[PDB]
């Protein structure tokens, strides 16, 4: 997550 947290990375597009």
């Amino acid at each position, epitope marked *: *997550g*947290x*990375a*597009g």
Partner: antibody, heavy 112, light 110 residues
Framework: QSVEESGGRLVTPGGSLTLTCTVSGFSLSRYNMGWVRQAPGKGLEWIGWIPFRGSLKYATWATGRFTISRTSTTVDLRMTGLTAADTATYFCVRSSDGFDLWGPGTLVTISS | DMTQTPASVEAVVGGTVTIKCQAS??????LIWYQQKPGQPPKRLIYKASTVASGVPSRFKGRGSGTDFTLTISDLECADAATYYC?????????????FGGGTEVVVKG
């Protein structure tokens, strides 16, 4: 569910201080966490983010002087080399599509 | 980094404002808005750029994607007077000096 910080106090210039975040109502193994600070009258400043798995991430200014770690029940923020520029309210946060839970904050004061 | 404009905006009760958040690097829908009243911790308003958090009224309308976002507050109430912050959570893609914008103060004119 909620989070709460502890450990804020007056710190002598150049000194070190560890803050602790204690959680209630959820599991630290299933949630990311972070730290934010706010100097009086200024904006929110992200400090870092400890995901429930993977690498820690830090603001570029915090790297090398501040570290974040976990236990099964707490997360901490270990600060070194504190100066009056670090005087602020420090918040721990639960992170889950953004900071959904904030502590009341704990105050770190370096006296000039 | 994250740039919010205006720094402050004043609007009448019942009115509408749109405030802006610009990311220098693409942050997808990884964008959160918070409301902070002086002397209180922030409250998460909107996550995933446009999803209102539970209990938040629908007159808080987050929009945008990528590098440009807006928050529109309509039917302004005195209770909406606060500073609003945007926040990028792309920690596994970008480094940050600050993941938050600088804040927009909203002054409600009675």
């Amino acid at each position: 569910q909620s989070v709460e910080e502890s450990g804020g106090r007056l710190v002598t210039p150049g000194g070190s201080l560890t803050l602790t975040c204690t959680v209630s109502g959820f599991s630290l193994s299933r949630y990311n966490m972070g730290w934010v600070r706010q100097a009086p009258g200024k904006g929110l400043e992200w400090i870092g983010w400890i995901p429930f798995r993977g690498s820690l991430k830090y603001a570029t200014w915090a790297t090398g002087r501040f570290t974040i770690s976990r236990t099964s029940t707490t997360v901490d923020l270990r600060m070194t080399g504190l100066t009056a520029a670090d005087t602020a309210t420090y918040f721990c946060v639960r992170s889950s599509d953004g900071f959904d839970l904030w502590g009341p904050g704990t105050l770190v004061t370096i006296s000039s | 980094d994250m740039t919010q404009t205006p720094a402050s905006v004043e609007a009448v009760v019942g009115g509408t404002v749109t405030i802006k958040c610009q990311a220098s690097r693409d942050t997808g829908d990884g964008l959160i808005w918070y409301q902070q009243k002086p002397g209180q911790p922030p409250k998460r308003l909107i996550y995933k750029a446009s999803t209102v958090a539970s209990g938040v009224p629908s007159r808080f309308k987050g929009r945008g994607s990528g590098t440009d976002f807006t928050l529109t507050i309509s039917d302004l109430e005195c209770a909406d007077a606060a500073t609003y912050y945007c926040h990028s959570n792309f920690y596994n893609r970008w480094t940050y000096g600050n993941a938050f914008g600088g804040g927009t103060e909203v002054v409600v004119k009675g």
